[PDB]
Design a protein around this ligand. Structure first.
Ligand SMILES: N=C(N)c1ccc(C(F)(F)F)cc1
Ligand SMILES: N=C(N)c1ccc(C(F)(F)F)cc1
Ligand SMILES: [Cl-]
Ligand SMILES: [Cl-]
Ligand SMILES: [Cl-]
Ligand SMILES: [Cl-]
Ligand SMILES: [Mg+2]
Lengths: 142, 133
């Protein structure tokens, strides 16, 4: 692991714990797999702890961010979820799935024009026709 | 950075005119070549209101000037996700990806501009990069 001075330096420098290899890679994989297990088992509170832990460890990991965003969406913290989905989109650049879920969140936030803009962005830019079918099903419902 | 601040804020939990004032001051610094002071002001603005495309775009431009190409690209992508209709961030992401030795990502950015932007001057610029790729 990392000595305390190295962890403190990372806190003070704005760096991730990932950047200083504070926990072995295999253990982080285990933690992600357990977080997914909790999620799939309906243990949302525990899944939330684990996805928060993962995102503290590496705020630039798209899948860690996507997991927490999904949990926030389930818990109806729609603005926090939308905020994380936007970050997740930016980090991956290529995948419009977070923009699709942002659209769902915006509908629940009573921002239907923002939602429409999200679904249209998916339709116009994604080459994933299966995702477009889902986005189009929201757009057609208006 | 600004992205890490946005993520940490989400993990854990001023009149528009005044914000407009500070944005203009940051631009004033930028235009005089006071890049470091402009960067502080844009970083401040992105802490106060990160999901504001004008603040993101200004900070991303400074990172691009400073050859911090990955940070710039990440911020331009946020701006595009939030704004959706302006392809200027996609165009600059393409430039950044070229400098990051990611020519296929760059090509995808410039193609998006040509296919979707209504900014004819931006489309010429994107095509000139494509011709070099
Ligand atoms: N419906 C089409 N003809 C069509 C064209 C382009 C794309 C894109 F390249 F954007 F993925 C997706 C679908
Ligand atoms: C699945 C699904 C759920 C809701 C809608 C909407 F309410 F937006 F129409 C569309 C598709
Ligand atoms: Cl120690
Ligand atoms: Cl990238
Ligand atoms: Cl709206
Ligand atoms: Cl444009
Ligand atoms: Mg056109």
């Amino acid at each position: 692991g990392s000595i305390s001075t190295a962890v403190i330096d990372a806190i003070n420098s704005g760096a991730t714990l990932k950047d200083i290899n504070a926990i072995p890679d295999d253990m982080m994989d285990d933690i992600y797999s357990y977080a997914y297990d909790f999620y799939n088992k309906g243990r949302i509170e525990e899944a939330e702890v684990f996805f928060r832990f993962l995102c503290i460890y590496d705020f630039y990991n798209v899948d860690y961010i996507m997991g927490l965003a999904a949990i926030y969406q389930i818990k109806e913290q729609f603005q926090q979820a939308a905020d994380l989905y936007a970050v997740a989109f930016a980090l991956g650049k290529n995948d419009y799935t977070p923009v699709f879920h942002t659209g769902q969140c915006q509908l629940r936030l009573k921002a239907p024009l923002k939602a429409k803009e999200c679904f249209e962005l998916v339709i116009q830019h994604s080459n994933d026709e299966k995702l477009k079918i889902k986005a189009q099903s929201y757009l057609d419902a208006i």
